[PDB]
Amino acid sequence: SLKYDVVVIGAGGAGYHGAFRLAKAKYNVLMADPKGELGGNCLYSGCVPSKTVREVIQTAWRLTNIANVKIPLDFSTVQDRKDYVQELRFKQHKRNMSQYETLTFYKGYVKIKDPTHVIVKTDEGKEIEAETRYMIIASGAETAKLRLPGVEYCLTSDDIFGYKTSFRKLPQDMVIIGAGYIGLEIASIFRLMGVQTHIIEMLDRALITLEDQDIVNTLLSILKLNIKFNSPVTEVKKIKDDEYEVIYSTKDGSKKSIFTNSVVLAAGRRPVIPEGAREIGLSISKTGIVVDETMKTNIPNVFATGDANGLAPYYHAAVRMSIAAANNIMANGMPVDYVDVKSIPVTIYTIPSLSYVGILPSKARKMGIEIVEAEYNMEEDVSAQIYGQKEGVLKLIFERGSMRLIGAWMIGVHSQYLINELGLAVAYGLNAKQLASFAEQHPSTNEIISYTARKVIE
């Protein structure tokens, strides 16, 4: 009834970067999100605040290893800094949005009527009915709605890192349900702030999202967390404030119990499908809305970007997917842009962190690619030594013959920065020689990459 070029459902990374590119091309674009803010869940309660918290505490700890006396920091001060940062960024995305005159934004939820028609339902409000030529579904994911008694007594990430959260005081000890990336991250950071942590995992292994058990095992050997495997939780009991009981079965079948001050549910997140999506015939699987590499669904004027598709549930990937949807829409659905998920780096933000990119040795084995590995030991890097954080390794994965760098992984200080240099090499197929001949800035940690590449040849 009002008319637009594109509707974007969801205003996280998956949505707004695309929307901004379209708007800049003078496309009329309607974006709607219930939060009424940009950044989605990742800004509201994921990466941004979690890293903020991670940095403040890492800075405290490095200083404690250097001045070798203990440093006094209240968790409420850490949570203030997390909020100050979230607040700057909400304002900044609004101020950047306000520059695009042909972009209209609504605080509300989009329901789909048919491939060219939607209805935006606002908070205390009416139906806005809209017509459109293309649609970008960028509705993200949510915390997995588990059916287990006591679920209501568990904290989630939203509670721990949410903007203006009231979780502002540390417990003496905490049980984390789940050994995936969110759980391990939470276990790492809270342990560093003085909390006793226990992880209980249903399955036999941590980090299912990473297919390579040898890499997972190396990280666990460095982390030395208290992890119980093969231990489904069957109930959470609340005794009183700050007193819970988590009940669980074991690999034998015998029930067992652990008492704690605080229970955190770190299950996987699940894709969020907008109302009406099934009804217009959109192919949807377990992992999410099915898309090809151009982000196009089985309905040809409908794209799906970010966690809604499940292809690579990390914020930087969602942004990349968003821009590719925008490009393809501008080219009127001709496939002019594509996303290469292999070459997207991933970081698990434990302390130390694990980063990786490309093809790792186990997938290489299954594809029949013959490889050669090069190895560096992080005890020998300058910054590691300064800060007293000497654990970890870098591993470069080269294909035999071409010696193309086809993959890389790294546990240690600054892996999040190094992984990008290496991801670039991987994405455009540089070889050991090119890596050896490059001369990274001394004394930065990136200097271990050309160094490690010089090794393989020698």
By CB under 6 A, the residues from 295 to 324 that bind ligand ADP are 306-308, 315, 318
Q: What is the DSSP letter of 349?
A: -
Ligand-binding annotation for 114, yes or no, is no
Contacted by 354, from ligand ADP, a copy of itself, none: CB < 5 to 8 Å by type: none
Residue pair 10/36 in contact by the 8 Å Cβ criterion: no
The verdict on 269 binding a copy of itself (CB under 8 A) reads: no
101 is an interface residue for a copy of itself by CB under 8 A: no
Choices 34-42, 206-214, 245-253, 396-404; region in contact with a copy of itself by CB under 8 A: 34-42
Within 10 angstroms of residue 280's Cβ, the number of other Cβ atoms is 14
| Residues numbered 395-414 forming contacts with ligand ADP, rule: CB under 6 A | none
Q: Judge whether 404 and 431 are in contact, CB under 8 Å.
A: yes
**Any long-range contacts for 111-116 (C-beta under 8 Å, 24+ apart)?**
111/274, 111/275, 111/276, 112/274, 112/275, 112/276, 112/277, 112/279, 112/280, 113/276, 114/280, 115/280, 115/299, 115/301, 115/302, 116/301
- Residue 110 touches ligand ADP, criterion: CB under 6 A: yes
The one among 71, 144, 331, 334 contacting a copy of itself by CB under 8 A = 71
**Site track 151-190 with ligand ADP (rule: CB under 6 A), x = hit:** ----------------------------------------
Residue 88: name its binding partner from ligand ADP, a copy of itself, none (Cβ under 5 to 8 Å by kind): a copy of itself
> Taking CB within 5 to 8 Å according to partner kind, which of ligand ADP, a copy of itself, none is near residue 162?
a copy of itself
- Residue matched to tokens 């009127």: 332
Nearest of 162, 128, 166 to residue 30 by alpha carbon: 128
Q: Does residue 200 contact residue 248 with C-beta atoms inside 8 Å? A: yes
Q: Is 152 in the site for a copy of itself (CB under 8 A)?
A: yes
Among positions 317-356, residues that touch a copy of itself (CB under 8 A) are 317, 319-320, 323, 337, 340, 343-347, 355
Binding flag, residue 34, ligand ADP (CB under 6 A): yes
Residues in 120-139 that interact with ligand ADP by CB under 6 A = 125, 138-139
- Selection from ligand ADP, a copy of itself, none that 290 binds (CB < 5 to 8 A by kind) is none
Instruction: Work out what residue 442 binds among a copy of itself, ligand ADP, none; the CB cut-off runs from 5 to 8 Å by kind.
Output: a copy of itself
Q: Which single residue is written with the structure tokens 């903020």?
A: 52
Q: Which residues pair with 112 in a beta bridge?
A: 118
Rounded to 5°, the CA angle 294-38-165 comes to 125
| DSSP category for residue 107 | S
Asked if 326 touches ligand ADP (CB under 6 A), the answer is no
CA 441 distance to own-chain centroid: 29
The residues binding ligand ADP (CB under 6 A) are 9-15, 32-35, 40-42, 109-110, 125, 138-141, 272, 274-275, 306-308, 315, 318
